[PDB]
């Protein structure tokens, strides 16, 4: 299966996906990295690995639909089968999500359904949980609500901040995002006709 990874920043999840997809038994190959922001570190990581990059600046488009449309064009150009959102910080439009239904994955730094949205660690620290974690899920139109593929729990330590907790949680993100990608690329897991997760 041919994969596009979309990023907005550092790219530690991208790097973990690059490392796993180059293992001999990997059922996924990463063919293109797309950033919505110029000059971010994930673009360097992609180039060092010999993977084509594109920047598609959301700020240059009238609305979400046109922006997603420009992404979809790249996706078709590289004949992509699966899309991974890896630190990608934009909400995607309905029809784009419908088109890639069953074929687009996201990593989110909480145990969904808790702490949806773009500041999950701040919410987790404000609420005072002692266990948080991360989630890989299929992308549905409703944000951070698609079908869950894998999760991993991570302790919150007393005195944690967003810096120290996100560092601990990323260590677990870097394990389940490659595992989930391999599950979907191999056809072991798919989005079922009834809309629930199906293990084959
Ligand atoms: N339809 C859909 N899109 C999705 N995108 C993602 C990607 C990862 N999750 C996100 C959840 C919420 C946001 C969010 O507040 N964004 C703001 C930009 C924030 C800013 O810089 O000011 C926006 O864009 O205005 C972003 C990403 C998942 C995800 C999903 O599950 N469904
Ligand atoms: N709403 C999605 C979200 O919060 N994504 C989070 O952004 C970070 C990106 O790091 P990276 O650029 O080093 O992979 C990761 O922790 C990811 O789970």
Residue 132 bridge partners (DSSP): 154
Method: X-ray
- Give distance in angstroms: CA of 90 to centre of ligand 1: 4
CA angle 9/167/6 to nearest 5° reads: 25
- Atom of ligand 2 lying closest to residue 9 CA: 12
Residues known to be catalytic: 108
Tell me the domain boundaries of the chain: 1-200
Strand, coil or helix: what is 81?
coil
Determine if residue 159 is left, alpha or beta; phi over 0 gives left, psi from -120 to 50 gives alpha, anything else beta: left
Q: Is the CB of 9 under 6 A from ligand 2?
A: yes
CATH assignment, 1-200: 3.40.50.170
The 10 Å Cβ neighbour count of residue 144 is: 19
Instruction: Name residues whose C-beta falls within 8 Å of residue 139's C-beta, 6 or more positions apart in sequence.
Output: 83, 85, 92, 97, 100, 104, 105, 106, 146
- Atom of ligand 1 lying closest to residue 146 CA: 31
Instruction: Name residues whose C-beta falls within 8 Å of residue 8's C-beta, 6 or more positions apart in sequence.
Output: 35, 36, 37, 40, 42, 87, 88, 89, 90
The 10 Å Cβ neighbour count of residue 81 is: 17
- Give distance in angstroms: CA of 144 to centre of ligand 1: 8
Q: How many Å separate Cα 62 from the centre of its chain?
A: 25
Of residues 136, 190, 139, 174, the one with CA closest to residue 45: 174
The number of CA neighbours under 13 Å toward the Cβ of 7 is 26
Q: How far apart are CA 5 and CA 19, in angstroms?
A: 13
The 10 Å Cβ neighbour count of residue 38 is: 8
Sheet of 53-55: strand order equals 53-55, 29-35, 2-7, 82-85, 104-108, 131-138, 148-155
């Amino acid at each position: 299966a041919r994969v596009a990874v979309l990023i907005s920043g550092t790219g530690s999840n991208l790097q973990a996906l690059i490392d796993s997809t180059r293992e001999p038994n990997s059922s996924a190959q990463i063919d293109i990295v797309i950033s919505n922001k110029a000059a971010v570190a994930g673009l360097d990581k992609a180039e060092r690995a010999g993977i084509p990059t594109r920047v598609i600046n959301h700020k240059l488009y009238k609305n979400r639909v046109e922006f997603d449309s420009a992404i979809d064009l790249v996706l078709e150009e590289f004949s992509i089968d699966i899309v991974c959102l890896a630190g990608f910080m934009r909400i995607l439009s309905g029809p784009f999500v419908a088109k890639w239904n069953g074929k687009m994955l996201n990593i989110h730094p909480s145990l969904l359904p808790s702490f949806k949205g773009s500041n999950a660690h701040e919410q987790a620290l404000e609420t005072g949980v002692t266990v948080t974690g991360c989630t890989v899920h299929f992308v549905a139109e409703d944000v951070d609500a698609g079908q869950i593929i894998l999760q991993e729990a991570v302790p919150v330590k007393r005195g944690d901040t967003v810096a120290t907790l996100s560092e601990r949680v990323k260590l677990a993100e870097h394990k389940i995002f490659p595992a989930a990608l391999q599950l979907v690329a191999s056809g072991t897991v798919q989005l079922g006709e009834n809309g629930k997760i199906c293990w084959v």
